[PDB]
Symmetry: D2
Subunit: 209 residues, 4 copies
C-alpha cells in the first residue's frame, strides 16, 4: 500500500530541533537547518497537550501550533482537508483544525466554537489551574483512525499567546530523505547549537512503573 506509507510517514515527526526557551528567531534556525544533508523539509512548531470541551463533552488532544506556509514542507495534513482550510490559521484569529472523528465526538462542524483547556501545575491542593480559551473550527481533516481522534492544529503565534509568551516557536520539525537517518541528523545539528537546544527523533517512544 503506497498511500498507507505516505499517510503514516507523513504524520510522524521524523526529527525536531527544539528549545527550552521560546524561539522568536526561529526563521534563522530554519535557514540554518534547511541545507543540512538529508533534510527535505523544515517547519516551526509548538507542542501543547490539553483537552477540548464543548456542550458538556471533553476530549483529550495534542495541539500543534503551525505556520501553514511551512507546514506543507513536513506534513500531509493539507492533502486531507475535508472542510475549511489550514490557511485560516492566522495569528489572533484563534481558529483550530480538528480531525473528523474528534469533531464528530464533540458535535462540532465548521465555524463552530470549541474551548481549548490547558492544564498548568500549581502547588495548591487543586493541583491544576486550567487555562481555557475559546476557538473556532476553521478546518477538518481525515487521515487515519489514530490521528483523527487525538491531534489538532492552531496558529503558531496563538500557541505562544496561550502560553503567555512572545511570538515564537518551540522548535523546528524536520522531514528527511531517509527516516532512518533522523537520529544522526538531529544529533549533528544540535552539536553546533547552544545548550538550550535539544534533539528528538521518531525512535523516542509505555512504562509499567
Amino acid at each position: 500500500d503506497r498511500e498507507l506509507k505516505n499517510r503514516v510517514l507523513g504524520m510522524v515527526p521524523q526529527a525536531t530541533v527544539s528549545s527550552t526557551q521560546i524561539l522568536t528567531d526561529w526563521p534563522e534556525l530554519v535557514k540554518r537547518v534547511e541545507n543540512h544533508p538529508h533534510v527535505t523539509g523544515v517547519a516551526p512548531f509548538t507542542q501543547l497537550q490539553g483537552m477540548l470541551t464543548a456542550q458538556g463533552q471533553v476530549a483529550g488532544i495534542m495541539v500543534t501550533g503551525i505556520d501553514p506556509k511551512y507546514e506543507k514542507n513536513v506534513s500531509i495534513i493539507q492533502n486531507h482537508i475535508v472542510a475549511g482550510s489550514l490557511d485560516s490559521l492566522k495569528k489572533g484569529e484563534f481558529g483550530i483544525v480538528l480531525g473528523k472523528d474528534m469533531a464528530d465526538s464533540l458535535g462540532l462542524r465548521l465555524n463552530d466554537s470549541v474551548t481549548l483547556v490547558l492544564p498548568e501545575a500549581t502547588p495548591s491542593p487543586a493541583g491544576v489551574v486550567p487555562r481555557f480559551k475559546r476557538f473556532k473550527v476553521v478546518g477538518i481533516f481525515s487521515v487515519g483512525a489514530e490521528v483523527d481522534s487525538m491531534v489538532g492544529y492552531i496558529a503558531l503565534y496563538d500557541a505562544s499567546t496561550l502560553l503567555r509568551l512572545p511570538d515564537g516557536a518551540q522548535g523546528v520539525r524536520l522531514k528527511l530523505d531517509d527516516i532512518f537517518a533522523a537520529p544522526q541528523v538531529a544529533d549533528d545539528i544540535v552539536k553546533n547549537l547552544p545548550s538550550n537546544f535539544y534533539a528528538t527523533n521518531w525512535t523516542y517512544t509505555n512504562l509499567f512503573n
Copy 2:
C-alpha cells in the same frame, strides 16, 4: 485568633494511614486505628484530583471521597455547611459538596449539575473520564479551601476509579498535632507493605 486556628487546623489532614491497594475492609481499620493512643477520630478517604466544568467554565479541584457518618470525627466541614447537607453524599447518587467560591465561579447553586473530569494517562495523552454530579451541599470555611476542595460519596470515588467499593486510606485526628509523625509511623510499622504513613509535617 482561636476561630482562625480551628478553621485552618480543622482542614489539615494531620496524619493518614493509606494503602496502594483499595481497602474494602476499611471499617475494621477505622476501629483498629481509633483505639490507638492520642487518636481522637478516624475517617476513610479517597483523594482524587481533577477538574469541574459547567456552562463552559472549568476549575481545578481536589475531591475527597468520604463517609459523612465518619467524616465529622476528623473534619470541621460539617460545621460550615451553608446549603444542603453532607448527609446527602450516598453511594450511587453522585452528589458533590463544593465550596462557596468554587460554586459561584461555576454559577452553581444547590441541586445544579456539574461534571467532574478526571485525567487518565494515555500512551497515544489524556483520555479524560467525566461524570455528571449533583451539588448536594455548599460549605464556607476559608478562601483557599472554598476554591479548591470538594467532597463526594466514598464509593462514588472508587466507582469513578472503576474499582470495588473501598477506601484509599484513613485520616487520623489527634489530641496533639505534633504527635502526628510518631503515631502514624507506629501504626504503619506493624501493617503489610501496601500501607504507608503520611503526616502534616511533610509537605
Copy 3:
C-alpha cells in the same frame, strides 16, 4: 546504508499489545497474536525506567525485562553482543545486559556489580552482557530477565505485554489496533508512530 536501517529499525518496538495488569498468561497472548497477518515475530516484555549507579556514577536507564528465547524474534541486540551473553538472563539471578557506552560511563565490565534505582528503591545486579548497536541506544537501555522485572515490581511472574515485529512497519497501527479490538479493557495497543511538550 541498508545496515543503518537494520540497526535503527531493529531497535524500535514496532507495535505492542500491552496491559494495565501484569499478564501471567502471556504465552497464551503470544499464540493468539503470532499468526495474525503481517506479524513475523513476538516476544514478551516489561518496561521499567530508573537509574543505574556504580562507584558513585549515575545514569538514567530504560530497562526491559525479556525472555532471550523469544527476544531474538523481534530484536537485533543478540547480533551485537560484545561481551557475555543474553542467555545469562535467567529468573532470580539478577543479571543485566548493558550497552557499551553506559557501561563505560559507570566504569563497568563483565561480571561487575551495578545497582538499579527505581521510584528510592535499590536492587543490585550483575553485568552478564554488553552490546554495541548505535550511539543512542548504547547509552540508554538495558535488559534484565522478564521475571526479575516483575519481581522488582512486587508482582507475580508475568509480562507487561508482547512486542510485535511485522513485515511492514507501516501496518503497525492497524495490526495492533485490530488485535486489541476484541480483547478485554485491560489491553491496549501501542505502535512506533507514537512519539516533547512545551
Copy 4:
C-alpha cells in the same frame, strides 16, 4: 514536651513567596515582605532534589540553598549543629551541611567529600541525565529522625550555580507569629506581586 513541638514546628516551612523565575533581586523582596503583618522572619531559599553519593553508598536528599545570616530568622537548624558551622556555607566554596543520620549512612565526617547528583529531565528513553558536583561537608546537625536523613543545606548561590543560573533565589521563606495566619499572609503578599510569583504554605499536603 515543648522540645518536641519546637523541633517539629521549627522545621516546617510556614509559608513561601516563590517565583518561576530566579530572583536576582531577592533582598528587596525580603525588605518588602518582612514588615507585612504577622511576619517575624524572612529568608531566601532555593530548593533542589537529588541524591548524595559517597563511598559506594547512595541516598536521596532534599537540598536547600540558604544564606546563613538570614536563615537563623526562620530556622532552628543553627541551634542543633553538632559539627562544623553553617557560617562555612559561602558562595563558590561548595560546602554542605548534612543531618547526622545521612552522614552516618555515607560514612561521612567533617571535611569529607560527598558528591551531589541532580537528575535533569531529557526526552530520550534514558529519562534523566545526571549533573554531578563535588561538595565538602562543613557542618552536621541533629534535630529529628526524619529531617536528619533527608535534608541538607548549601550556599544560596551554589544552588543557583548548579542550576546553571545567575546568582539569585527561588523565593523567600516566611516565619510568622501565628502559623495559622500563614495561608492568608502569603496569599495577600502574592496578590500585589507579578504573575511569576506564587504562594505556598504548610497546609499544602
